[PDB]
């Protein structure tokens, strides 16, 4: 049940700005169930790839999360970054919209005129997002346990009980977050998940925007995002160490992981 794409990874290849694949992108013409989207895809992945939908936070737009599009897509994923129907949509709505974005990627996969016709394995999907869009990604995972992976950043949700989530979940947290403080948001959410493979990666001295476009830790955060998606969406055990390891980075102020084997 593995779906391996690309060459055997190294720390260097995963820390680099781009993976091996050429990336192209397009705006979605008639978004269905969300405000706007950009689709990033590899032109040449050598097989179908999984799809990942990424949602910004309250007031925010695609620009905040855009860096993930090329970063992931270059490693062999189809990535859709969205704007929400309103910038003031709440976590539940962001989750519906995220899923709508995945549905619409599946639609384009079956549309002969689309640049992503036949490129997507619609059975292998993941979710990411910032703040309320991170809470939305956790809600998506709770409500859709067939998702293969979740990797929210600086998550915000008025509930921290995600105990039903069985989807492999990487929580990026920002140490000095004053919007969704770690000790009331990201850590309780992480500790609530008792049934899954999971990880907690807190970025040293990070503000609430520490994993957004233009951040100073794209080597480390990009490595870990891509590794987690590869291990869990692709069942690619070449990535078990990169996904599950303490990355031994001075950029990391707190590292925790459970049910995450280093074994390949």
Numbering used by the authors: 30 to 293
In the authors' words:
The IsPETase structure belongs to the α/β hydrolase superfamily, and the central twisted β-sheet is formed by nine mixed β-strands (β1–β9) and surrounded by seven α-helices (α1–α7). At the active site of IsPETase, three residues Ser160, His237, and Asp206 form a catalytic triad and Ser160 is postulated to function as a covalent nucleophile to the carbonyl carbon atom in the scissile ester bond, as in other carboxylesterases. Based on the scissile ester bond of 2-HE(MHET)4, the substrate binding site can be divided into two subsites, subsite I and subsite II, where one and three MHET moieties are bound, respectively.
Arg280 at the end of subsite IIc is a polar residue and shows protruding shape, which seems to hinder stable binding of PET substrate beyond the fourth moiety. Based on these results, we predicted that the substitution of Arg280 into a small hydrophobic residue might allow more stable binding of longer substrate, subsequently leading to an increase in PETase activity. We replaced Arg280 with Ala, and measured both the BHET hydrolytic and the PETase activities. IsPETaseR280A showed similar activity on BHET hydrolysis compared with IsPETaseW/T, and the result can be explained by the fact that Arg280 is located distal from the catalytic site and thus does not directly participate in substrate binding when BHET is used as a substrate. As hypothesized, IsPETaseR280A showed increased PETase activity by 22.4% in 18 h and 32.4% in 36 h, compared with IsPETaseW/T, when PET film was used as a substrate. To investigate whether the replacement of Arg280 with Ala indeed changed the conformation of substrate binding site (subsite IIc) allowing longer substrate binding, we determined the structure of IsPETaseR280A at a 1.36 Å resolution. As expected, compared with IsPETaseW/T, IsPETaseR280A showed an extended subsite IIc by providing hydrophobic and non-protruding cleft. This is an important finding as the structure-based engineering of a residue (Arg280), which is located far away from the catalytic site with a distance of ~ 23 Å could be selected for enhancing the PETase activity.
